[PDB]
Structures are given as C-alpha cells and as structure tokens.
Amino acid sequence: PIETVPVKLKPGMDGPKVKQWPLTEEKIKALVEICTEMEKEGKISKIGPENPYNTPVFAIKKKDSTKWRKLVDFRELNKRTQDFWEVQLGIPHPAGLKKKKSVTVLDVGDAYFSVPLDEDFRKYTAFTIPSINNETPGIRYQYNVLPQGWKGSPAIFQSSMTKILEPFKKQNPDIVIYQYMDDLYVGSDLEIGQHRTKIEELRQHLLRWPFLWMGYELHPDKWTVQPIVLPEKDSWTVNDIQKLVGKLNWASQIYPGIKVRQLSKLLRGTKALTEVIPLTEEAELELAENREILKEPVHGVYYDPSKDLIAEIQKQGQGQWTYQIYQEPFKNLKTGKYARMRGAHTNDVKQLTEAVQKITTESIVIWGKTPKFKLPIQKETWETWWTEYWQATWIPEWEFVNTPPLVKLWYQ
Amino acid sequence: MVPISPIETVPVKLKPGMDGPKVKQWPLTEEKIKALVEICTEMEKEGKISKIGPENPYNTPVFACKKKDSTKWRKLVDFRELNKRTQDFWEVQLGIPHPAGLKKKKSVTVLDVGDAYFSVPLDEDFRKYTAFTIPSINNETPGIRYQYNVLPQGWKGSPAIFQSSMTKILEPFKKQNPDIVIYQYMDDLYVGSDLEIGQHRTKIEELRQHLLRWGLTTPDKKHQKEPPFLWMGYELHPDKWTVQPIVLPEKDSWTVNDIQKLVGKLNWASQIYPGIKVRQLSKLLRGTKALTEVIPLTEEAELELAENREILKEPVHGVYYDPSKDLIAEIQKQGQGQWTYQIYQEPFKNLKTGKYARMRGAHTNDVKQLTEAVQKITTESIVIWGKTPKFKLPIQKETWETWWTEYWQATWIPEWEFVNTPPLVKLWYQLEKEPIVGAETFYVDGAANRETKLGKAGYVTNKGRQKVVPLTNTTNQKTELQAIYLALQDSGLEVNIVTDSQYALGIIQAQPDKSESELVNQIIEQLIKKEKVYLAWVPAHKGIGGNEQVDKLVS
DNA sequence: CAGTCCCTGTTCGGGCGCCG
DNA sequence: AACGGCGCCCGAACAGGGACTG
Ligand SMILES: Cc1cn([C@H]2C=C[C@@H](COP(=O)(O)OP(=O)(O)OP(=O)(O)O)O2)c(=O)[nH]c1=O
Ligand SMILES: [Mg+2]
Numbered sequence A: 001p002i003e004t005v006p007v008k009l010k011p012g013m014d015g016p017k018v019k020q021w022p023l024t025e026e027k028i029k030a031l032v033e034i035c036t037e038m039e040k041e042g043k044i045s046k047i048g049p050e051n052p053y054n055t056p057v058f059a060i061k062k063k064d065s066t067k068w069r070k071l072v073d074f075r076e077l078n079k080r081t082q083d084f085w086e087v088q089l090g091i092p093h094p095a096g097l098k099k100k101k102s103v104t105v106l107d108v109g110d111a112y113f114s115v116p117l118d119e120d121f122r123k124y125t126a127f128t129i130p131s132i133n134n135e136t137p138g139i140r141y142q143y144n145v146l147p148q149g150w151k152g153s154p155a156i157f158q159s160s161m162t163k164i165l166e167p168f169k170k171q172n173p174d175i176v177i178y179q180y181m182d183d184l185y186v187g188s189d190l191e192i193g194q195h196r197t198k199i200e201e202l203r204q205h206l207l208r209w210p211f212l213w214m215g216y217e218l219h220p221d222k223w224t225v226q227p228i229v230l231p232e233k234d235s236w237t238v239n240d241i242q243k244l245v246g247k248l249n250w251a252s253q254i255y256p257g258i259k260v261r262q263l264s265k266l267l268r269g270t271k272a273l274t275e276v277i278p279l280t281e282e283a284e285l286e287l288a289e290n291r292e293i294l295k296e297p298v299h300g301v302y303y304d305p306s307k308d309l310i311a312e313i314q315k316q317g318q319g320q321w322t323y324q325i326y327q328e329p330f331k332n333l334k335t336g337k338y339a340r341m342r343g344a345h346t347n348d349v350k351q352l353t354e355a356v357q358k359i360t361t362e363s364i365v366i367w368g369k370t371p372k373f374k375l376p377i378q379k380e381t382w383e384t385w386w387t388e389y390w391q392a393t394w395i396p397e398w399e400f401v402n403t404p405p406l407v408k409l410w411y412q
Numbered sequence B: 001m002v003p004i005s006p007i008e009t010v011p012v013k014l015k016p017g018m019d020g021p022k023v024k025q026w027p028l029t030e031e032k033i034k035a036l037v038e039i040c041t042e043m044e045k046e047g048k049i050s051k052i053g054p055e056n057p058y059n060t061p062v063f064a065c066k067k068k069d070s071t072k073w074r075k076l077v078d079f080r081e082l083n084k085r086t087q088d089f090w091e092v093q094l095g096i097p098h099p100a101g102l103k104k105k106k107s108v109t110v111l112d113v114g115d116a117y118f119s120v121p122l123d124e125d126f127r128k129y130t131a132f133t134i135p136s137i138n139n140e141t142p143g144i145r146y147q148y149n150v151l152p153q154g155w156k157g158s159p160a161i162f163q164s165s166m167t168k169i170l171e172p173f174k175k176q177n178p179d180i181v182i183y184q185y186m187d188d189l190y191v192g193s194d195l196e197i198g199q200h201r202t203k204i205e206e207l208r209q210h211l212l213r214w215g216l217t218t219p220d221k222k223h224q225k226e227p228p229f230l231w232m233g234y235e236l237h238p239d240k241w242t243v244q245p246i247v248l249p250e251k252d253s254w255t256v257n258d259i260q261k262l263v264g265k266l267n268w269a270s271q272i273y274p275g276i277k278v279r280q281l282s283k284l285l286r287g288t289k290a291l292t293e294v295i296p297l298t299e300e301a302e303l304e305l306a307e308n309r310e311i312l313k314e315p316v317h318g319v320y321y322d323p324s325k326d327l328i329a330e331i332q333k334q335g336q337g338q339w340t341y342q343i344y345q346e347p348f349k350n351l352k353t354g355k356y357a358r359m360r361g362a363h364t365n366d367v368k369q370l371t372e373a374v375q376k377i378t379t380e381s382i383v384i385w386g387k388t389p390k391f392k393l394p395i396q397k398e399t400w401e402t403w404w405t406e407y408w409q410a411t412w413i414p415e416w417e418f419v420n421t422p423p424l425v426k427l428w429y430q431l432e433k434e435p436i437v438g439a440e441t442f443y444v445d446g447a448a449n450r451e452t453k454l455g456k457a458g459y460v461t462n463k464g465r466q467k468v469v470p471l472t473n474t475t476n477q478k479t480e481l482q483a484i485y486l487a488l489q490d491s492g493l494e495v496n497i498v499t500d501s502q503y504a505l506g507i508i509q510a511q512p513d514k515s516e517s518e519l520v521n522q523i524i525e526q527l528i529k530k531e532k533v534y535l536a537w538v539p540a541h542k543g544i545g546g547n548e549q550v551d552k553l554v555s
Numbered sequence C: 001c002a003g004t005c006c007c008t009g010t011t012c013g014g015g016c017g018c019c020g
Numbered sequence D: 001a002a003c004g005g006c007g008c009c010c011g012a013a014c015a016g017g018g019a020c021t022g
C-alpha cells in the first residue's frame, strides 16, 4: 500500500558488478538460513544469470552477540547512487550529538524491510550465496524491500522514521537523535540510569510500529586527542638531537613556526652518535618555544562538508595504534591513539579492524561521514582476515599503503 | 507451431542501440557439409530447430569440430559477433570442485545429461537473433535457413542459462532427498549417499525420472555405476582419489610452446605430487616472444625437469575429507623463493598438495614469503572445505614473534605450531634500536647527475675516516645505496650509519634477505657479517651532524 | 611551484593447464 | 576457428611518491 520511491543511478554509471568472495562454512550456513526466511517473507526473491549485477555478501556477529547477521557490501552501489542519499533526500547531521555525555547506538535496519523497493532498482541489489567446494552453482537473490546497508534505505525511510520519533522528541526535547545507515544514534546529558531508561522508552516506541534489544553505548565527551609531544630527557646525545630535529622538521609542515636553528647548531661537526651534548641557553629557549607551539591549535583547520574525510593509521607496536583524520594534508581535524584493544599482543589484523571501526564510529558522531582509510597493511593480508573480525553493519572505503617509519611522529 | 518445453525460459535481451548478427558464411570442406545437413534435419523434427524465411535479416557462420576420441560430432557456431551485442550475464559458476573436498560416501553415481544445451529452450523473443544458413552443396543449392529454439553451443549466454536451469530442476528433488549429495558441475551430476547399493540405485532412477519430466535425458552410455569414476578429470575410488595419468612430452629439441605446455601440466600435477618446481622452466619463457623458437634447456632447468619426472614415476593419491578431524597444512621451503605444502588430516594421508613460488616485490625475505604462502593456503582451504587449517610452519615462534611485533605493517598468521624441518625460516640480521656505544659513526651520502648519469658516493666518520668514490652510469638512489655499502665494507663488526636517503633506509629496515638488485644483495651480505648495525635517518639540506660534511664531498 | 626522473607498485590480458 | 569457469607465470601499461632541475 506504499508507493515505491523511484531510484536511479548517477548518470553515466552502470550497476555494481563485484564478485563474491569465498565464505566459511558457518557463514554460508548462516546466510542460507537467513535468506530462506527472508524469501518466505517476500523480502528477497531468487533471480537468474540475466541480471548482470552482483554485490558481495557475508555474515557478522556484533559485539557480545551470538546471533548471525547478514551483511551486504553495498559500498559500490552506494557511491553509484550518491546523488540520491546526499542531494535529493539527505539527513541533517546534529552538531550537538558529539557534545552529549552518552550516546547509544540502536540497530533499526529491520524497519526498512516494511517499505517496498522500486521495481526498476531491484536488479542492482543482486547478491550471490556461494557453496563449499563449488558443489552447487551460486544461489542468486535480489531484494524486494529496502535492503540493510544501502544508503538509500534510511533516506527513503526518513519520512517514516520522523513520524515514529515525533512523539518521543516532543516528550524529551533535550535528546538528540541521529540516523546513519541501519543505526540510530541517541544522545543525552542524563545520568547513566536516566539515559538507559529513556533508551528503553524509545525501544518500546519502535516496538509499537532482530537486534533492537542491543545497545552499544558511546561517550563522546570522554574522547581524547593525541597531540604531538616532544621527549624530555635529563641528558641529550647526538642521536637524540638528530631524531629531535628530524621530528621538528616534519612537524613544521603542520606548525609553520617551529624552528630548528639553535638545535642544529648543537650538531656542528662529525660527532659520534652516543656523544652527550649539553643543551645551550638558546637551545633550551628554542625547544621550550617549540613545545608551546605544539600546544597552540593549527591555523585555518575547519570541517568542509563537501570534502571527503581521510583517515591514516600507524602501527606503533605493543598494542599502540595512532590515527589522524583530515580532509587536506597537514590539516588534521582530529588525532588520536588506541591502546590495549581486542587482539593486543597477538593479532594485528583484529586490532586494525577494531581501530577502523572505532575511527568510523567517531566520524559518524562528529561529522556524519565515514572516512576513507589508508591501512598500514598488505592488500592480501587484509582481504584474508578482515571479515573474521568485523562487527559493524557498515563498511568504510579503504586503500593500502606501505610507509616505513623514518621518524616516530605521533608516538615517541 | 513448436511445443514449449517444461523448462522455464530465461529472458535474454541485447545491448541497447544494436541489432542482430549479419556475418557471411565461411567456406568449409565437404566433410563438414555432410555432417551438418543431417543434424539440422533431426533437430527440426525434434523441435530443437525451426526453419525461417526472408523475414529474418540475420546470418551467422557455423564452423564445427568433432568430439574428443568418440564417434559422434559436436556442432559448433561462431557467435563472436552476437556475443558482442548480447547482454552481459553474471556467471553462477564460481569455481571448480576439487576431489579433496568430497566426503566419504558409501554409494556414488556419476550421471551425464545427454544433449545438455539442446534440451534447454531459448528466449522466445530472442530466437529471431539466431539465424544461420545450411548449404547442402558447397556451390550449388543455396540451402534453406533455420533458427535455434534451444541453447546453441558457442553463445556466451548458453553456459550460464543451463547451469541456472539445471539448479531449478534439481531444487525440488534435493528438498525431497536431503541426505543425498548432488555435485552439479555443468551437465555432469555427482550423486552420493550413505545408502546401500540397492537403495542407492532406486534413488538414482527416481532422479533420472525426475529429470526426464523436463526433457533431460541421462543415457546409459556415460552412466557410471562402479569405481573407478572419471569425474572432473580424476579417478574416484571408494577410499581414495588420484589424478588421471599425466603424460609429459619428451622432445629432443624444446621450443617456447613446448615449455608452456610443460609448466602447465606440472602446475596441474602439483596438486597431489609433492615437490614439483617450475622456477627454472618458467624462467626460460622470459623475454623471448616467439612461440616457434627453439630454446636450449639450462643446466638448472634440466635438473629441475629431471626431478619432476622422478616424482611422477611413483603413483600418488589423495584421500577424502572427514569433517570430524582437524585440517592440517604443513609448508616446506624449497629455496630460491620456492615453497611446497601438504594439506592432510591424518599423517602421510594427504588431501592435496601445492606450491607457492610467486616473487612479489623487488626486495623481500623468507618471512614475508612464508606469510604470503599461508594466505594462499588459507583462501584455497576456505574454497574447498570452508575452514582454515592448522598450520605447521618451519619458523620458530620466537623468530615470528620478533618479525611481526617489530614490523610497521599489520601482519598475522592463524593458529600454527613450529615444526623442526630444515631449512628453517629466520631473519638473517637485526638492526639495532639504539646507537652503539664505541662503534664508529659513518655519515654517508651519494649524489648523481640526471643528465651525465655520473655520480659520487662516500662517507665521513667521527674518527676522521673518509672516502669518496666516483661512479659512472648511476642514479641518486644507487649512490645512496652505494654510500651505505661503502660504510659497511670499511667498518668493523659494529657500526652506526647516518643517512638522509628515505629510499635506502626503507629497503634495509624491512630486513630483506633477497633482492633483484645485485647492490642490495651485496648490502645484505655485509649486514649478515656484522654484529651490530644501527641505521639512523636525518633530513637532508639542514646542516645536521656530519651529514652536512659528507654532502659537500659527493655534490 | 611544474615537470621530469627513478623506483616500485597494481592491473590486465594472454600463454598454458584443467573442467564442461 | 566457439562459450564459460578456476589456477600459474608472463610482460606491457599505468599509477604514485621522493627528489632534483628550470
Ligand atoms: C566439452 C564441451 C561442452 N560444452 C557444453 C555443451 C554441453 C555441456 C556438456 O557437454 P558434453 O556433455 O560433453 O556433451 P553433450 O552435449 O552433453 O552430449 P553427450 O555427449 O553428453 O551426449 O557443456 C561446450 O560448450 N563445449 C565443450 O567443449
Ligand atoms: Mg552430457
């Protein structure tokens, strides 16, 4: 009884044609059981090879969840419908969500299954379930309703979502609610008891209309930033000063006022690396001046909503992972560090996966975008294991880099 | 008026803005003429082919070969111009079934659907786009033109349609027989069950009659009821499997096309024959771009070929998959970037074997290549069995712990244990983390001219030691490596080296043990001889330390 | 600052094997 | 002399960043 909102690809672009990657036995069995129930409920339908489009599919389990969830990698289809969920039917991002004391994330993706999808667009939602050892050909489906993980789903459902949340927002005007992908971000300055109580009221508000029982809690007011810090030693050697000048010179690309004149004068000659060099009166002055500039904010650094977010991650060792978020080089909007995440001291890929998910969550809260990641890892290594540790219902863009640490810039 | 078959049709369109094929026929021999007029007459009475007239302004040639060592023939076509204008299909064939992934079944039957493509209908509105004439005489009768009512052989949409139509027909039978396994690859059907031999034949005939309702015939010509079964190019026995006999050519003079077929068969044989190498044979296929050019076998390529023939002498076999037992994968180093592995569940009962010999990157080490081999085995195992095997690796836990905790890129190996089988994988040198007290400090630098290709490389040290070496036909990157090489040559067992070359430092910090560069290999040889080496980087053109001093000498 | 170079990386298409 | 699938080893074309030169 609902008219399907017409959806069209961006002009000059064809649908996604991404090959399905191999799935483990438990993931295939989970997807077969899930797709059988969705097919019985009319959410999906089997298709043939005359549909040239295809999108990868796999399965995840959220944090502390034993229930399999179907996850479609709609990254290719999303950027091929970018003028729809950003230009035509966009969602405004509240600047106060990051200021709230507690923010709970609620999975509302199941609500999209009640709204039908445009018949002309259903062919672009095709996915293929593989078989173990290629016993059977690929089992292809396509969506009949708004699919989870497609950015057009919250955009079309926004009109329906607003009417559902309208009574709750009038009851609590101080609560900020933001919707991104399959998730709902609810922030308030209430106490931990009062917050979780209001979250349960919102759950009952959605019930009167399979992961709604979960609630991942955030605290953006407790999110810390990792500045560039300089070492403080009692004695300095030639090697210590060479590393210090190397770090300050790279830092000059961010802070133009950093000087290395009086420090480079200490290295006059061809001295042994371990020779102790006492800092002169001017060297203490220049080093103290550079420590204050690192406390001053960078000039002309602000968020541009028309530009993409970029995120770089560095493996610092011993469970330490630093990161920077920027739109223009050396204009970091945020810098941070993670430590002692799951997989620390045993699994780099799980830590990197955790770090990517944390950075993306922060970016959704602060700016409403997901950054494109520059991952310090080989492509084949990441593509072999990353799905084993993914616990999020969205997937950011990423690329792979290899930059040896010539100087420890973000973590001494 | 042709009867519509029970199989559902697949709506096939064409790319917008394009029409159908209009290609003239190809003059063939009279042997092909008397081998196709009888086919179009039999397919016309069976409804597989209808006759058209002047209202069909299309045409397509129809060259044809035979069948492999058999009596019959295979009518082929040239839809290369139709494929360019036909819509793209998404292939549902995602891989090739491997016998090592088959589980134990008491009873096994291999079927073969006769006339596979000729039993599946074509789209009604698409039959008009398949026109072709058949001249009864080579230059007399013009020949009445026909069309296709089924799937033609040679059309790019025929395989995808048959595989999808076959699945829809088997779906109701599989739902009524859940305990029966049906491996469906193209038209060949592998049917297995743990039922008794008598009850198994009963369900086979039930399946043969089920497929017969849609016009799919399973004749007794290629019906297999007893081992050994020839399935997917293998020999299936009740408790083991092996590859069909592989014949390697033995010519006195080897060309280029002969080696390409040789390495191809060795790659196909390396799935169950352990220890096959193709490094020195494939090395002969470099540079030469003439398939009909004789290539003499190198002494290394001859010994490699001799060792592969001796492996193929003793017959080998693989076992089947048992889900109740763990999956084990063991890797060995064969030297020169060559790795071989075996996947098994019980000791010396290999499911399959394999090799990894890819050389990626100009500079690498055994630890990186072992990591790449683990990833290749992991993905291959998920395809075949859907799980990652436990690894047995010839690298110490302490060695691996040092590499991954100190590397700047994220790297990881799944659950594994050490196996003591030389040659062990190790790191051949370790760069120090702090400068070495008492070791001479070498400030190195190198500069070269872009135009004349001339350059210099040298060093200055804290003890007054100094060298400048002129270089001819070089680059700035080569002189920076040469400067470090000079410092390693002219220093004691412990040395501190200060450079401004991000290029050189990035190569050496990744602890390579092999390189496509003779200079890097010489640097590696020196790094191994040392007891302690500390590399430090400083920015150039900043008047820093001795780096400013050595910069004046080389530039 | 552009425009090169040097170096190293990925992508792709074809050679071969194998299946149908 | 056809089509589709997978694997390997190959080379040419292309991308991208440090570093030097006008
Ligand atoms: C071997 C082969 C096969 N095919 C297609 C056609 C039918 C299926 C199976 O072919 P087939 O089993 O060997 O021949 P088929 O048409 O079934 O006739 P039969 O020999 O089985 O009676 O794959 C093809 O297009 N080209 C080929 O070279
Ligand atoms: Mg057949």
Ligand SMILES: [Mg+2]
Pocket (backbone or CB within 6 Å): B445, B446, B480, B500, B501, B540
């Ligand atoms: Mg230099």
